[PDB]
Amino acid sequence: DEIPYKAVVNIENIVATVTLDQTLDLYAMERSVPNVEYDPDQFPGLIFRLESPKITSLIFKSGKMVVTGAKSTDELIKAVKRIIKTLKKYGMQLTGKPKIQIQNIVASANLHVIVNLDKAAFLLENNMYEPEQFPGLIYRMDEPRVVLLIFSSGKMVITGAKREDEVHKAVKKIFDKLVELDCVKPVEEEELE
Amino acid sequence: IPDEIPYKAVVNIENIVATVTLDQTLDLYAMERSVPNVEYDPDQFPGLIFRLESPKITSLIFKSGKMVVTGAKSTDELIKAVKRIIKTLKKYGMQLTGKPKIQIQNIVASANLHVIVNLDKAAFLLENNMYEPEQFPGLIYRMDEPRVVLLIFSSGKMVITGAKREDEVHKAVKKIFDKLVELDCVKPV
């Protein structure tokens, strides 16, 4: 019988960059914007936190802003607009539309099958499976360019992708390779009698 | 005036995975019957499993003559293991052409940086990394030169995988350590 694809992908976090194309005086911004933090002796950027959704924005003197916490593109965009609106309400001006670039997407997946890591470790290429050091199998994938953490339970962590379709491509790819190498057991399905 | 933070990391090789090319196709069914205490069940795994004790070494032998040897924690260890394995393969009938070449496929190492690492700060100052504690407690760094993956914990403990030479392992550790110091992300214990 053929093992059906039942993997479920969940985006855990997106890290993106927003260029405000202008130099910024963070001391001035900290004083102007309420409840933000700026201590250059501890961290070079001004820390702007948004609540529900939980989002953190790190603002650098170069005008580069790093936004972390969003779990979807829509969420990311709303957060950026929310952040920009505030910075505006308290003083900064924008010459043009800031561009948003995704730097990394961290996602999790559930393959819904048990993975034989001991077996996969010697039939897959480019990986680490040293259970006494890390409980999962680490696979450095080239296309797409991501790193995978794969656990015997079928749970996985995918990092390195900049687009959601790359995340999904990597999951289906390792799943298909694991099935091909006969390294998975679909325990959620009934068994041969 | 800040004290200098000298390099004090200690690296330890945890495992080496290597391949040994016996130059010949092999009948694993025959090898399993001839060599005592080995395992071959092609319905479960394509290679014959040959395990050594003291030190614990596992050798996977495929029909192509390719042999994967795992378990050794040093180059010397690796060599002694390969000689022992080939030795008994011969003691039981395998005719060995010439000198089999040995190729390191991966080295897994650990290191103690001996400094406390601020993962939250390094996460946003370094590139190529993941730090999502809910998914994995350490920071994962994909390095290009050498081509290795680093797992870094706030305690200073590290895991290094992907290298094929011991000097690459040391280079990687020194490199990330120097980067962390430059970004002011480490503190003395």
UniProtKB/Swiss-Prot annotation, chain B:
GO biological process, one term: DNA-templated transcription initiation
Keywords: DNA-binding, Repeat, Transcription, Transcription regulation
Annotated disulfide bonds: none
CDD domains the record matches: TBP_archaea
Transmembrane segments: none
Sequence ranges of the Sequence repeats: 13-89, 104-180
Single Gene Ontology MF annotation: DNA binding
Keyword Repeat in record: yes
Family per similarity comment: Belongs to the TBP family.
Function summary: General factor that plays a role in the activation of archaeal genes transcribed by RNA polymerase. Binds specifically to the TATA box promoter element which lies close to the position of transcription initiation.
Protein name in the entry: TATA-box-binding protein
Source species of the chain: Sulfolobus acidocaldarius (strain ATCC 33909 / DSM 639 / JCM 8929 / NBRC 15157 / NCIMB 11770)
